[PDB]
Amino acid sequence: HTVRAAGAVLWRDATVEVAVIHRPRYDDWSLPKGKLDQGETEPVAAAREIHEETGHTAVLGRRLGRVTYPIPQGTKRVWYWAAKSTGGDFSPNDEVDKLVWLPVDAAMDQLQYPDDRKVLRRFVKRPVDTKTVLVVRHGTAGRRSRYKGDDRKRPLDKRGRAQAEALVAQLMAFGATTLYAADRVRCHQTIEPLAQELDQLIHNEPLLTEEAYAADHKAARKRLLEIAGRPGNPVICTQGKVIPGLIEWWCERAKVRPETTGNRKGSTWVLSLSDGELVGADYLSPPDE
Ligand SMILES: [Mg+2]
Ligand SMILES: [Mg+2]
Ligand SMILES: [Mg+2]
Numbered sequence: 705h706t707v708r709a710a711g712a713v714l715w716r717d718a719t720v721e722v723a724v725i726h727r728p729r730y731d732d733w734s735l736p737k738g739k740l741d742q743g744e745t746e747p748v749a750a751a752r753e754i755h756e757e758t759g760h761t762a763v764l765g766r767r768l769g770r771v772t773y774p775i776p777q778g779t780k781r782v783w784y785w786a787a788k789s790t791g792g793d794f795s796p797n798d799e800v801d802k803l804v805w806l807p808v809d810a811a812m813d814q815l816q817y818p819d820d821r822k823v824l825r826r827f828v829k830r831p832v833d834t835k836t837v838l839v840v841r842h843g844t845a846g847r848r849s850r851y852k853g854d855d856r857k858r859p860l861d862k863r864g865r866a867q868a869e870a871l872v873a874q875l876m877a878f879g880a881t882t883l884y885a886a887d888r889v890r891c892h893q894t895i896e897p898l899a900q901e902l903d904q905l906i907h908n909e910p911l912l913t914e915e916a917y918a919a920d921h922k923a924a925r926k927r928l929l930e931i932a933g934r935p936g937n938p939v940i941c942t943q944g945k946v947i948p949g950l951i952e953w954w955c956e957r958a959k960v961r962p963e964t965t966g967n968r969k970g971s972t973w974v975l976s977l978s979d980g981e982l983v984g985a986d987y988l989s990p991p992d993e
Contacts, residue, residue, distance in 0.1 A: 705778045710750035711737025712787040713827040714762055719807050720832065722824070723758055723789075724814045726802040735820050736800075737782050745870070745991045746783045747877035754787055758803055759794040762787035763879040765834045766976045767986040768826040769963065771819045784823045786832045831978035836878050836937040837928075839973040841947055843867040843990075845890040854915055860893045863992070867970035868894045870991035872901050878974060881936035886912040891941040894970070898939065914945040925950065932977065947973065951985060958982035968993065 713735060714723040724733050738753035740746065747764055754762050764785040771782045794803040806814055808828050815821050843864030849855055860868060875898055883899055885891040887910040899906050910916055911927045928950055931938050944967055951973055955962055962973075962985040970990035976983050 707775060707777055707780045708740045708746065708749075709737050709780055709782040710740065710746040710753065711735050711782050711784045711823075712750050712754050712762070712764070713768060713784065713824055713832075714754055714758055714760060714787045714789055715827070715832060716789040716805070721805040721807055722811050722827070723760070724804050724806055724811055725757055725800045726804075727799060728801055729799075733814050733816050735784070735815070735823060737784070743870075745874045745988070747785065747988070748873045750783075750785055750787065751877045755792070756797065757800045758792075760789045760792040762789050764877050765832060765836060766830065766984040767963065767974065768823050771823065773819075784826075786827055786834075788833070830983045834976040834978050834983060836880075837932045837975040837977065838875055838878060838880055838937065838939045839947060839951065839975060840871065840875075840894060840939060840941045841944055841967060841969050841971050842888070842890045842894040842941055843970040845893075845969075854888070854913065855890075856887070857889050860890055864890070864894070864969070867990055867992055868897045871895070871970065871972070872898050874972065874988070874991060875939055876901065879937050880939050882934070882938045883907065884909050884931055884938055885941040886910075886943060886946070888913055888943065891943065895939055895941045909940070909942075912940070912942045912946055914943045917946045917949065921949065925953065928954075932975070933980065944969075951975075954982050955985050960985050962987055 736754050736757040740749040764787050766786045768784040843860050845858050845864050846861045883895050883906040885906045887908050911923050917924045960982050964987045966987050968990050972988040974986040
């Protein structure tokens with residue numbers, strides 16, 4: 705088996721301080737992480753584990769890489785995020801008995817595992833006070849038909865409806881506040897469960913269908929940057945042919961390396977921006993993968 709886990713560098717203002725935890729099971733100093741519970745995706749598991757271990761709520765930002773090691777059960781795979789504390793404070797729990805807030809240099813010395821230190825080096829390499837654009841490929845929606853129009857009305861299938869419900873907690877982990885969808889039923893439907901959770905309208909985006917993208921790709925780019933520039937953390941749901949065109953373009957101009965790549969239905973690209981520049985592009989699997 706591969707056990708799936710998630711962790712973070714939890715940080716707050718003043719340079720910046722990060723949280724290092726102490727665990728009595730091993731008498732060690734490390735970054736918060738834990739295992740995914742049933743039906744959870746990594747971002748959710750990170751936020752939960754940060755709250756359980758540290759007492760802090762937080763909003764995830766840039767992904768900071770992956771750590772993999774053997775365990776009795778097989779292999780543990782831990783994905784890490786940068787996480788801005790949004791409040792709270794620590795008190796001892798069974799897993800974690802002490803927590804210290806340390807500037808990065810002092811954290812680096814406090815952390816006993818080389819793999820943690822590597823994560824913290826990734827954290828400091830780029831800005832961490834970022835805003836976030838969440839580009840989502842619509843969920844599964846059955847078969848393309850022979851009628852012209854790119855099936856404007858074709859709905860999510862059962863699996864896709866489930867993928868949409870699963871996205872809510874995942875997108876909320878990144879502080880999603882505003883909703884945008886290409887002018888296709890299946891794109892809207894994929895973020896309607898989030899819309900219900902936030903109680904918010906979805907802005908329709910005819911410039912971001914595959915049709916419009918091909919006819920005027922420059923209009924789509926311009927619109928994406930417009931959406932990105934507004935306050936808040938926008939969710940933009942679009943189609944398969946649009947996404948790589950836009951992401952690959954934006955990564956190449958910003959000199960951003962995506963550590964993973966894909967484009968499955970119900971996947972999310974977490975785009976981190978600092979000062980309006982892209983500093984990260986993180987591909988997340990569909991929640992039922
Ligand atoms: Mg833990
Ligand atoms: Mg834990
Ligand atoms: Mg746990």
